[PDB]
Amino acid sequence: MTLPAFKAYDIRGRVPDELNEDLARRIGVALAAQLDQGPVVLGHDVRLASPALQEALSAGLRASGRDVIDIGLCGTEEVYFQTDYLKAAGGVMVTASHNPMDYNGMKLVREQARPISSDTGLFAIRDTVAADTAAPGEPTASEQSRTDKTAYLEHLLSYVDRSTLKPLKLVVNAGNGGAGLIVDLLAPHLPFEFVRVFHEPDGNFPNGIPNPLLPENRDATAKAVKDNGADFGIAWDGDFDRCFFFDHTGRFIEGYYLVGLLAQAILAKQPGGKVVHDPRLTWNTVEQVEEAGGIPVLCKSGHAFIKEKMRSENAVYGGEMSAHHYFREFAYADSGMIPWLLIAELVSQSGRSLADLVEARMQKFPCSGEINFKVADAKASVARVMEHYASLSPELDYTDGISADFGQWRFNLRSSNTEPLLRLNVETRGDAALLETRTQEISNLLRG
Numbered sequence: 001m002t003l004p005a006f007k008a009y010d011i012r013g014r015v016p017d018e019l020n021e022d023l024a025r026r027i028g029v030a031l032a033a034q035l036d037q038g039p040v041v042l043g044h045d046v047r048l049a050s051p052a053l054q055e056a057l058s059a060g061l062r063a064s065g066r067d068v069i070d071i072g073l074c075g076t077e078e079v080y081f082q083t084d085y086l087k088a089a090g091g092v093m094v095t096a097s098h099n100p101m102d103y104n105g106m107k108l109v110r111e112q113a114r115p116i117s118s119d120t121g122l123f124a125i126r127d128t129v130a131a132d133t134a135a136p137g138e139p140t141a142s143e144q145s146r147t148d149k150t151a152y153l154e155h156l157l158s159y160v161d162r163s164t165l166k167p168l169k170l171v172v173n174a175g176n177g178g179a180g181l182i183v184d185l186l187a188p189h190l191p192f193e194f195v196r197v198f199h200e201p202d203g204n205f206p207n208g209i210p211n212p213l214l215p216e217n218r219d220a221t222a223k224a225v226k227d228n229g230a231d232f233g234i235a236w237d238g239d240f241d242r243c244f245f246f247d248h249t250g251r252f253i254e255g256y257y258l259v260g261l262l263a264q265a266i267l268a269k270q271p272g273g274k275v276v277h278d279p280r281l282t283w284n285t286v287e288q289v290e291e292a293g294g295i296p297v298l299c300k301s302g303h304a305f306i307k308e309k310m311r312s313e314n315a316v317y318g319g320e321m322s323a324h325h326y327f328r329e330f331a332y333a334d335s336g337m338i339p340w341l342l343i344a345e346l347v348s349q350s351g352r353s354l355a356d357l358v359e360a361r362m363q364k365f366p367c368s369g370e371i372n373f374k375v376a377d378a379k380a381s382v383a384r385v386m387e388h389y390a391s392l393s394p395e396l397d398y399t400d401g402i403s404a405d406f407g408q409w410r411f412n413l414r415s416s417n418t419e420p421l422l423r424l425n426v427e428t429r430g431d432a433a434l435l436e437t438r439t440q441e442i443s444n445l446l447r448g
């Protein structure tokens, strides 16, 4: 057997049987042996066990001669930013993002906040930790506390021309995660009126786990937008590397359309740039990027693939439909803060509502949203789908599972790299009826 907490892209486990202070200390020792020379940035989220896991990590790192820079309670993107900004050897965020209260985890990066994933170091660490029965050494290096967020805040604000911002009324919903701290620190520098929902950080999560995809959690943001006449609403997961948008009618915006919107907003500042996108839903992003004078670059989904493709392409922006937005100037890392700043600027500068900015894109490229299927035999289910459609001779692409382009409609069908599911995305060229009949047809085949 192997330690179950070591996943494809990060560490995630129930505390204390799958993840605990002793494992965390061992992870720190193992990480020291994997990095180039330099100090290691540590930060943590609002979960009750997160401080103690970070302290154990720090103890293992310092026992192995690593200086530790403790940036304190923060968002995941702040570990990325500070790891790059401080020219650190690496960084670790202690977080379970959006998982239940008895779970925690770690996200690990090396120099320039490049990801450490299962095949790029994480499983090496796992196997080292699994075999480590050595006595815990004593610290041979120092810890410095560096909680100053000024550089990070200035960097966020550099994405917008503040003299063009209007005093929009924005609902913000931290979900009792960590986002509210950053909103409040940005607020003196912005003209917006914030309506704060579930704002105070609270690791007991009295209003539910910070997962804005849960319909009941969506409804708190929607209600606040509608009841206050807000221009739009923003909700974050617990470590706020994902943000979610609600238009002035309270409508949750499907994240697909944000990729094209943010690409056009970015390409205004940075003309002719490359934009990386995933293969699940594509047509709208390709069109919007091209119409803004950018170059769209198809990439396998998943932050490690997206970031490495952005690096190799010098891409200014990368976006996934699942609320991940990456920015070259942000060390090619994802931010849950930069996106709503860009959208607030777009609404301010264009005189258009968020609703209207995306409405014609939704009409032009209606999509199913991601639909998940737990099936008995994923390979046999996919084969059932492909055999059914074979006589139509779709254009097939294997960048990430199977993409089939039929002309007026297309789908992508993937096995997940983090769960044992099949995931389906369908979109059409302005045809809602075709979207539904094909989505239901594929759904029946997959369940068959």
Ligand SMILES: C[C@]1(O)O[C@H](COP(=O)(O)O)[C@@H](O)[C@H](O)[C@H]1O
Pocket (backbone or CB within 6 Å): 009, 301, 302, 303, 304, 320, 322, 324, 415, 416, 417, 418, 419, 423
């Ligand atoms: C961890 C993670 O959040 O999991 C998402 C879903 O990955 P998947 O199950 O393969 O569809 C990825 O898109 C995302 O980039 C990655 O950061």
Ligand SMILES: [Mg+2]
Pocket (backbone or CB within 6 Å): 097, 098, 237, 238, 239, 240, 241, 242
């Ligand atoms: Mg997260």
